[PDB]
Each structure stands twice: as C-alpha cells, then as structure tokens.
Amino acid sequence: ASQTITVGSWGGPGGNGWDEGSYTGIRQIELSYKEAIGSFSVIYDLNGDPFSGPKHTSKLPYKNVKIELKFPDEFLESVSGYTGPFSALATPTPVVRSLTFKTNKGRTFGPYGDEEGTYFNLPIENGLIVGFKGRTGDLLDAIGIHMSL
Amino acid sequence: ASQTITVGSWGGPGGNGWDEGSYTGIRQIELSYKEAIGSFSVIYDLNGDPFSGPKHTSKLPYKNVKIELKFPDEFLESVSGYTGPFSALATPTPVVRSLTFKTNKGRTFGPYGDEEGTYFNLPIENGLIVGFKGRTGDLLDAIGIHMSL
Amino acid sequence: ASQTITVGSWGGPGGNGWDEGSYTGIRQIELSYKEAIGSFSVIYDLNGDPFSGPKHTSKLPYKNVKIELKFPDEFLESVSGYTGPFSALATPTPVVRSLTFKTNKGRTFGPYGDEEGTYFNLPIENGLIVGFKGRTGDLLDAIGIHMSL
Amino acid sequence: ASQTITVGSWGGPGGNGWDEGSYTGIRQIELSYKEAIGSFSVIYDLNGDPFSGPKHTSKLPYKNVKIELKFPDEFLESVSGYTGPFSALATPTPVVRSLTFKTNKGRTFGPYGDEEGTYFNLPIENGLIVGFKGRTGDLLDAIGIHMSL
C-alpha cells in the first residue's frame, strides 16, 4: 500500500469525501465556477500515459475552464484560494470560493471564482503535486493534496 | 545531498536566509515573541538523540516561550499563522506575526504574537515535519517547512 | 515527473529495455520459465484497483506460472535469482536464468528456471517494491526494481 | 520519527547488532581488511557539514583504508562483496569477507578482503545510500543499507 505525504483538506466539512489517489504527475485539470468552485476533474500522468482521473461534478450551470499544462516540463509550484460559506445555494458550512493555480514556467491560471473567504495558500519549494483528494456534494466543499519528490 | 519535500516560505523577502536542514523528527521548538515573531531555533531528533538546530535570534525585547513535544509519540499535525508588515520595527515588507502549533496528541501551543495579517494554514494529514527553513533579520521574516514520511 | 528509488539491473544488456513504472503495490506476477525465465509481466495495484501492467511476453514454448499475492496484507520481502548466459537460445551475453520470490507472509514461490550462474539477492527490511524495470528480447535479459514507503 | 527505505543485511547473525540511522549523504568511508573485513566507520554528511557516526572497530591487526569521496559531486552508485564463514579466526557463521565500491564518477575502490563465499550486488539506478546498518563483534558480520532520493 505505498503512501504519499498528503497536505491539508482546505475547505469545509460538508459533502461526501473523495480521494483520487497518487499518480506520477498532472496533465490537465478541469473545473467549473461562478461565485464558488463547482466541478473539478483532473487528467494525470500515469507513467507517461495520461490517466483520466475520477470526475467530481457540480450540476450548477457554472462556467467551464480547462487548464492544459505543458508536462513534464511545466508543473504546479503553487495552489492558493478562498474558503467561505455560500448563501445562494443555502449552506452554512464553508465551501472553496475561488482557486488560483500557478506554474514553474511563470503562468498564473488567474483567479477562478469569488475571492471572498479566509485565504489558503500552498507554495512548493521542492516536491510535486501527484494527486488530489477533497469533498464534493453540490459544489467543491474542500480540497487537499498528495505530494511526492 | 538527499532532498526533502519543502513547502511554503510564508512571510516576506527581507532578512538573511537560513535552512536548518532535514532531520529525523522534532523534540523541542523555542521562540520569542511580543507583537510579531522574533527569535526562532529548534532541537530536532537526529536518530533518537537531541540535535540542536542553529540559533535564529532576534535582539528585540520579546517574551520567551519553549514548546516541548513528547517525541516519538507526539508530532505536529499542523502549523497556522499571520504574515503582515510590522510598523513598529518599521518594515514595508511582510514579516511573520503569529505562530500557533496544533499537535497530534490534542495540545495546541496557542497563538504567539498578534493574530492580524493575511492567514496561512498547513494542515498535515499524512507525513511529518522534519526540518525548518526561513529568513530572519531583526525578527522572523518568513518560515518554511521540510516534510517527510 | 514523480520519481521513485530504482535499484539494480541484475542481468545482461541484450534484449530491448522496458520499464513498467511505479504503482501503489503489486497484486499478481505471471512469468514463463524452462532453463531460463522468459515472459515477465505484472498486475499492479493502482489506488485500490488492479491495473494490468504492460505485458512482456517471449515466444519460447516455456511453461507459465501465475503468482497471486494477497495484497495488501501480503507483499514481497525478497527477490533472489541467478544470472547467466544461455548456450541453447544460443546467446553470448548474460540472461536472467532463475528467479525466486519470498513474501512477508512466509510463502516463497520456488526457483523458477534452473539455478545457474551468478546469484543476486535483495532482502528488504523496510520498504516496498512498487514497480518493475528490465530487458526482454527472446528471454528476460535483465530485471531491476522500483521501491518506496 | 521519519522512516527510510532499508535494504538488505548481507552476512551472518554473529556479532552485536548496530544501526547508524540516516543522514543527508556520504563523504568518506573507513575499513580495515585482511582475509575478511574488520572495522567499519563512516563520515556522514549532515546538512552541509561533516558528521561522524559511531565507530565500529575490529581489534584485529587488519590493514586500514580511508575511502574519501568528493562530496556532493561524487557519490556511491554501487556496492558489492562476498559473505561467507571464516575458519582461521573460527566463526562458523557467515561473515563479510570482501567490500568493493563503485562511484558514479567511475572510481572503484577495489575488493578489500578475500573474495570467497556467496556474492552480493546492490547496483543503483536512482537513489542515495544515506546511512549504514549492520553487525560487528571482532569482524564485520553483516552490513545493510538505508536509501533516500
């Protein structure tokens, strides 16, 4: 059962949890958004071959946005974002409001969602995101991370 | 030169940089504080024998606290805080303001320094801290963390 | 490009180099043997799901064997075997002649292939074989290993 | 208490057990040999500064050799040797007779000891020997390896 350093779960206790597992790099991430994040589904590298990760969708009519990254030369060095309660769909428990991804090759996949909430930032000085874990239900309640060197 | 996952720099760019190195675990942490975090040094476990990490001392009149962990049974399962500039020490750049250590047993060495600034929260779910990195000048300008399994 | 520890290449340099990569653990091994080990392919574990690894099949009319470990309570605790040339596949360079596997649950899957040439042995006290490296032309010319915690 | 991949223990169960834990790299290795290996002590690298682990010496009037590696550019990419009982100093238990080291730089530190017995080979494609573990009484009974990335 090898393991991996898992960091956080930023977000809230609501929703059903999911854990995609660990895999060898990331190739594209897909997510929907409007005033908070909804659908989130990643395509990873599984030993050089793309592996479709499990899809965590929010039926909300939010806007879809694909994040293709030039792997293996480019990869994530930072993930930051906001957590806060969301009245429109009626839930007192925190949700991730906005997520912002940044890569080693200087590109920032600009703020997706509303930047309202309590700030979460995860800068990486050495190490690599190798998998995603978190809670979906109606939209993205929480998000955490698997890492490796 | 084995390496170790290094996450974060939280804080700012001033002061001279230091990297304590990666080590087998953490036994004691010693800090000084009064409106922002100043002196920072730790004593780690170097293969079941206390090894004293380099002294990162501030010269300001700050209160002294000692954090003692019941190593091997007790390990940090968290690190949270506030980075914001300090107008009394006169720095335009963000410096680190509060440092609070939640633990695996259940203890929390409550907030040190003022809880005002942009928030930072590294909840560890699987993996251990094993070394510290940072930047100190007059106070503690930024802390960074080494992680391992 | 997530990276793992890689050890070995116990064998010779002919055949075409293969590398199945690193997974979460090993669940079943299938191979064929008469005087040499011919076919070598494994059914790995991908995040609690079985993932059939790439097939490294050889045309020699060898007798095949399937080795079912009871992942995850059961995993490999040693890989040992013999490395030597083969006058019958009429070849001058080293070929992996035999291979015996021992699990942490005591079971040992007997030398397969005949025990001739120089002996290799890798006892593992703490760690996990997480994937396979290697060379297959007509027979398995070399075998190597990926390990992690 | 972080953990590390430990591979091996080649030799017998004679002698009193020993473990040096793990560090950030290896700078120099010391040993006395003669028909067998006797004393084994090493200068470890601890976070940029030389660090000396436990001395493990044979009282035997064996000849002494200091292997001095050019750290961090040069490192061990392979270790191998011979383990077999000894009868002139009358121990019917497998003891380590020979030690040969290869470095990524192409320098091999010649078979020290008598090459009689069962051969062991640990060649390394990716990873770092990061500390030593083993048995010693009047001569080196066994030897194992700790590795990292």
Side-chain angles (χ1 to χ4, degrees), chain A residues 1-62 64-69 71-149, chain B residues 1-62 64-69 71-149, chain C residues 1-62 64-69 71-149, chain D residues 1-62 64-69 71-149:
Chain A
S2 28
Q3 44 186 325
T4 241
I5 262 133
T6 292
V7 163
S9 210
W10 302 264
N16 317 96
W18 82 76
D19 181 344
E20 294 191 330
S22 256
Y23 297 80
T24 276
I26 296 164
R27 286 167 173 282
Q28 169 170 147
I29 299 177
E30 286 176 41
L31 60 91
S32 73
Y33 65 106
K34 198 126 200 79
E35 21 266 343
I37 305 289
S39 320
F40 181 86
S41 68
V42 197
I43 300 195
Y44 300 98
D45 182 42
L46 201 240
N47 282 136
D49 268 351
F51 194 88
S52 216
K55 286 171 183 306
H56 313 289
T57 325
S58 158
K59 284 207 177 182
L60 298 150
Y62 288 17
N64 318 78
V65 45
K66 268 154 151 86
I67 296 183
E68 294 234 357
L69 32 79
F71 160 101
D73 188 53
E74 159 181 68
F75 53 75
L76 256 1
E77 80 180 355
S78 156
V79 166
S80 54
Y82 286 86
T83 27
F86 186 28
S87 281
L89 325 186
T91 166
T93 196
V95 170
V96 325
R97 294 315 293 300
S98 123
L99 234 41
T100 134
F101 304 107
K102 180 112 40 179
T103 90
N104 68 137
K105 321 229 51 178
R107 306 154 74 219
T108 128
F109 290 83
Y112 291 113
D114 268 28
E115 290 192 296
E116 69 169 289
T118 154
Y119 190 54
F120 88 87
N121 183 38
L122 172 86
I124 294 159
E125 183 172 285
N126 191 18
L128 212 60
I129 298 163
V130 123
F132 285 99
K133 147 151 233 164
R135 0 216 350 117
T136 301
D138 280 291
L139 72 190
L140 183 59
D141 288 79
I143 207 227
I145 248 140
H146 291 309
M147 300 174 100
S148 159
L149 285 311
Chain B
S2 59
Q3 62 192 333
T4 195
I5 278 173
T6 320
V7 140
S9 283
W10 294 278
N16 227 96
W18 95 61
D19 184 353
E20 265 176 313
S22 221
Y23 292 76
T24 286
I26 302 183
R27 300 173 162 300
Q28 193 161 147
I29 291 175
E30 296 189 4
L31 63 75
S32 86
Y33 56 104
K34 229 189 203 237
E35 316 107 320
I37 297 300
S39 300
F40 198 89
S41 309
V42 11
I43 284 152
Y44 314 88
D45 176 49
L46 172 69
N47 291 133
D49 240 78
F51 188 87
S52 50
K55 289 297 135 81
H56 312 308
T57 47
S58 87
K59 287 184 95 63
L60 315 164
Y62 283 18
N64 277 88
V65 68
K66 269 130 210 167
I67 305 175
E68 228 182 70
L69 273 8
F71 159 82
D73 307 284
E74 186 176 40
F75 53 90
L76 268 18
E77 81 159 47
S78 187
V79 188
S80 13
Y82 285 81
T83 177
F86 194 23
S87 274
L89 297 215
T91 68
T93 254
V95 110
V96 35
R97 310 297 306 289
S98 122
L99 228 37
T100 108
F101 303 83
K102 298 174 161 292
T103 214
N104 77 128
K105 291 324 305 158
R107 312 159 79 190
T108 120
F109 299 69
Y112 291 97
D114 304 318
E115 289 214 300
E116 66 168 59
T118 234
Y119 192 41
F120 93 62
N121 182 43
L122 176 73
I124 306 163
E125 171 148 328
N126 195 42
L128 272 49
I129 289 160
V130 111
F132 278 100
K133 179 168 192 149
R135 187 139 209 119
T136 60
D138 293 47
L139 230 44
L140 184 72
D141 284 85
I143 357 197
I145 216 115
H146 291 309
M147 283 182 65
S148 264
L149 243 17
Chain C
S2 157
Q3 128 217 230
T4 193
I5 272 165
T6 291
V7 99
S9 257
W10 281 294
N16 279 129
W18 93 56
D19 190 313
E20 295 169 299
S22 285
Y23 303 64
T24 318
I26 306 288
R27 275 178 189 241
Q28 193 173 297
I29 290 155
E30 286 183 278
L31 51 73
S32 72
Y33 65 104
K34 264 198 80 154
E35 306 91 43
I37 287 284
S39 297
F40 187 83
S41 82
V42 19
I43 282 183
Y44 298 97
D45 185 53
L46 190 44
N47 291 114
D49 256 20
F51 180 85
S52 50
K55 304 235 158 293
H56 302 318
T57 199
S58 110
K59 75 100 150 176
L60 299 307
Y62 282 5
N64 326 72
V65 55
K66 193 189 169 199
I67 297 147
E68 295 180 274
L69 294 333
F71 174 85
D73 304 302
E74 198 177 54
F75 56 90
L76 258 16
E77 164 198 61
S78 283
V79 173
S80 59
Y82 277 91
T83 225
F86 197 6
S87 284
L89 257 266
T91 151
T93 56
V95 132
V96 290
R97 298 306 295 283
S98 182
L99 225 49
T100 100
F101 292 107
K102 301 177 189 143
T103 85
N104 69 133
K105 233 52 174 137
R107 314 149 87 235
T108 112
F109 297 75
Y112 287 115
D114 74 67
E115 299 179 285
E116 206 120 295
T118 138
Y119 176 66
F120 61 95
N121 169 44
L122 176 76
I124 305 151
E125 316 205 49
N126 176 67
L128 216 75
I129 283 183
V130 93
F132 284 105
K133 188 168 65 96
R135 304 197 77 144
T136 292
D138 297 307
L139 302 309
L140 173 66
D141 286 68
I143 205 203
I145 236 90
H146 285 311
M147 290 180 59
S148 36
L149 283 331
Chain D
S2 36
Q3 54 188 334
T4 231
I5 287 203
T6 299
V7 121
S9 208
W10 292 275
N16 270 156
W18 105 60
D19 195 318
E20 288 160 14
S22 274
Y23 313 72
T24 26
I26 284 72
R27 304 185 156 263
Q28 124 168 17
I29 285 172
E30 200 132 33
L31 57 87
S32 72
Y33 59 120
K34 149 110 289 311
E35 313 92 354
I37 305 288
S39 348
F40 195 73
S41 47
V42 5
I43 308 205
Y44 282 113
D45 171 271
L46 189 75
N47 294 120
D49 243 353
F51 174 81
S52 274
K55 198 86 116 144
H56 294 317
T57 62
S58 161
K59 231 124 203 188
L60 284 22
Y62 277 12
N64 295 78
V65 298
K66 310 81 146 93
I67 288 83
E68 161 80 323
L69 289 301
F71 178 97
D73 309 299
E74 164 169 59
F75 47 83
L76 258 10
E77 82 173 2
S78 172
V79 186
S80 62
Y82 290 85
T83 247
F86 202 178
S87 267
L89 67 98
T91 133
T93 264
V95 106
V96 10
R97 315 294 307 279
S98 195
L99 269 183
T100 168
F101 289 101
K102 251 57 61 163
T103 89
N104 52 322
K105 263 26 191 168
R107 300 163 76 221
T108 115
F109 299 88
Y112 301 106
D114 263 14
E115 297 198 78
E116 256 112 39
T118 175
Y119 182 68
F120 73 84
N121 192 30
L122 183 75
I124 298 178
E125 276 218 311
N126 178 47
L128 284 198
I129 268 176
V130 88
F132 279 97
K133 173 193 178 191
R135 311 198 71 96
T136 292
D138 296 320
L139 30 180
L140 183 52
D141 294 87
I143 196 67
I145 266 99
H146 280 315
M147 298 159 89
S148 322
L149 249 17

